[PDB]
Design a protein around this nucleic acid. Structure first.
Lengths: 135, 307, 50, 50
RNA sequence: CUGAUAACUUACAGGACGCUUUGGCUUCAUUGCUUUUCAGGUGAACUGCCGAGUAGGUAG
């Protein structure tokens, strides 16, 4: 269904729901679902996350018990943005080292045309990252 | 003693911009650069990968232009403010204020946050009316912490005695050339100063060799040589020298005019300090800390008018 | 104007911030020195009134 | 093709004519003019009363 | 409940012809804008994988 967030940090609140969807695709190991953000404003995500192709799973039951829940386009991961941030420009040198690093340089004028971020983590390790999602 | 409608000094300490270089192995230098992002543009400056360390460079002159007022219409106000500098240097001396300014050069207080997360950093001074063999401070984080550690350097006498003679003589000059060597970790956060925009992060920059480069503010640099002010009531942190001395972290004035110990309330007792200094009994610690602060505002310069 | 502390200027409003614009000129980084050049002309105009 | 700072023609000739140390209390050479002023301390030496 | 009551001003029309303002001219001597000034909130978005790829992809 189309989930309504009715209190609100939707950006950080919509991002936990995918962590269930991250873990539920390892118990059964499917990828037969689709992801759709209808109210993709140019500021926020909007209080409508929807799964298209959950409602009885362990995370969403306790979310629904309290007084706040009701339970074309291309939403693709874009990890080319992740190398634009300059902690990854030096990871990328140690990749390509395998020589003069000093003849490599920066860009000094970049213009990133409306990316959008949702912060998450790993569960094998203790390591964080970003789910960069555009149209 | 009422203040004139035309009073002004010049500063006696004149810094310059700070230039950031990067020393690769094979021992060669390239000016540091930074990025620019739009989608409200934020600039990010970090060390490149293969670098070994980082130089910095600027230059300070103890011009000693605080000896007489720059412009002063009333001659009684001029004749008083001349007698304090000739009485401070006879009865107290420039040794206490020369040491506090020179520590801020000789450790990295003018390197504001880039000191943080470093392995070791070193300072090398090139003083101008000098014989030779440049004064160098090595491994400041461990070797130099307390003031005594500076005085155990082999020539710490010979460089305080420049700044005293630069303040004592009617044409005193004392140019210094400071150069730092920061041994960072790999791909380190470096923070330069940044422009003022009417309202996200735009650095203050110059051009070194046809390329942009971040520069510590010329005014940004003198604000860290002048972190001397710890003479306020119940003082803990030393402050930047100023009138009714502010603290910009917790946005408040210590030495507020209701305390009676801002600069203008001590200027109106300028005749009062001439009789204390011209006795033979050595004055109290409370009343020379008022004089150390009174001289540090003539070294700072400014305009002191009213009405 | 009279000489007492104004009461609007508390410690927050007196520790605030004051932005001002100036022209700033300085010698570039790796220059050697600076040239200056002008010219004077001593031309005997004090002999008689204009 | 670029702007550049300059020292004004009137600022420059005000330095060539700092000669006047004949005023009655002479220490510092003043810029030559009628009732010779001193811009540091805002007074005329050589005042019309003198 | 008004110097009260009541009240159709109409019809037609050619202003024209002509017209040399011109001559002369010295605005100009003199000049110091200065003094002082921290934009900060950068602990966030990590570390691999393929590829000759400073391009571009992908994992969690």
């Amino acid at each position: 269904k189309t989930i309504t967030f009715l209190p609100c940090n939707n950006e950080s609140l919509a991002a936990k729901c995918l962590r269930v969807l991250h873990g539920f695709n390892y118990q059964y190991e499917t990828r037969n679902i689709g992801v759709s953000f209808p109210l993709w404003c140019d500021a926020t995500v909007g209080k409508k996350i929807s799964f298209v192709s959950l409602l009885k799973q362990h995370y969403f039951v306790q979310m629904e018990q309290l007084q706040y829940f009701h339970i074309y386009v291309s939403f693709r991961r874009c990890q080319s943005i992740d190398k634009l941030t300059a902690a990854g420009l030096a990871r990328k040198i140690r990749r390509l080292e395998k020589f003069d690093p000093s003849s490599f340089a920066q860009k000094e004028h970049t213009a990133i045309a409306h990316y959008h971020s949702l912060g998450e983590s790993s569960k094998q390790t203790n390591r964080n990252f970003r789910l960069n999602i555009r149209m | 003693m009422k203040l004139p409608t035309n009073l002004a000094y010049e500063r006696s300490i004149d810094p310059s911009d700070v230039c950031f270089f990067v020393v690769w192995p094979d021992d060669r230098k390239t000016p540091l650069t930074y990025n620019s992002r739009t989608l409200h543009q934020v600039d990010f400056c970090h060390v490149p990968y293969g670098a070994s360390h980082i130089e910095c460079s600027f230059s300070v002159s103890f011009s000693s232009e605080l000896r007489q007022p720059y412009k002063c219409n009333s001659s009684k106000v001029k004749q008083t403010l001349v007698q304090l500098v000739e009485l401070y240097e006879t009865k107290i001396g420039w040794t206490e204020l020369a040491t506090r300014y020179l520590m801020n050069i000789c450790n990295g207080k003018w390197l504001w946050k880039n000191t943080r997360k470093a392995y070791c950093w070193n300072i090398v001074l090139t003083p101008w009316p000098w014989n030779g063999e440049k004064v160098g401070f090595e491994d400041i984080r461990t070797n130099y912490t307390s003031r005594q550690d500076f005085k155990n350097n082999k020539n710490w006498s010979a460089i305080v005695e420049m700044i005293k003679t630069a303040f004592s003589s009617t044409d005193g000059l004392a140019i210094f050339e400071v150069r730092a060597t920061l041994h960072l970790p790999t791909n380190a956060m470096v923070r330069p100063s940044q422009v003022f925009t009417e309202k996200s992060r735009v650095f203050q920059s110059t051009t070194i060799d046809g390329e942009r480069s971040p520069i510590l503010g010329a005014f940004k640099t003198g604000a860290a040589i002048a972190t001397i002010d710890d003479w306020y009531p119940e003082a803990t942190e030393p402050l930047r020298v100023g009138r009714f001395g502010v603290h910009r972290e917790d946005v408040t004035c210590y030495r507020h005019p209701s305390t009676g110990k801002d600069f203008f309330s001590i200027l109106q007792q300028a005749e009062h300090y001439i009789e204390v200094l011209s006795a033979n009994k050595t004055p109290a610690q409370e009343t020379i800390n008022d004089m150390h602060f009174l001289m540090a505002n003539l070294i700072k310069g400014g305009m002191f008018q009213h009405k | 104007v009279s000489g007492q502390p104004i009461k609007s200027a508390t410690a927050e409003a007196l520790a605030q911030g004051n932005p001002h614009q100036v022209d700033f000129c300085h010698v570039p980084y790796g220059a050697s020195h600076i040239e200056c050049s002008f010219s004077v002309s001593f031309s005997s105009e004090l002999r008689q009134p204009y």
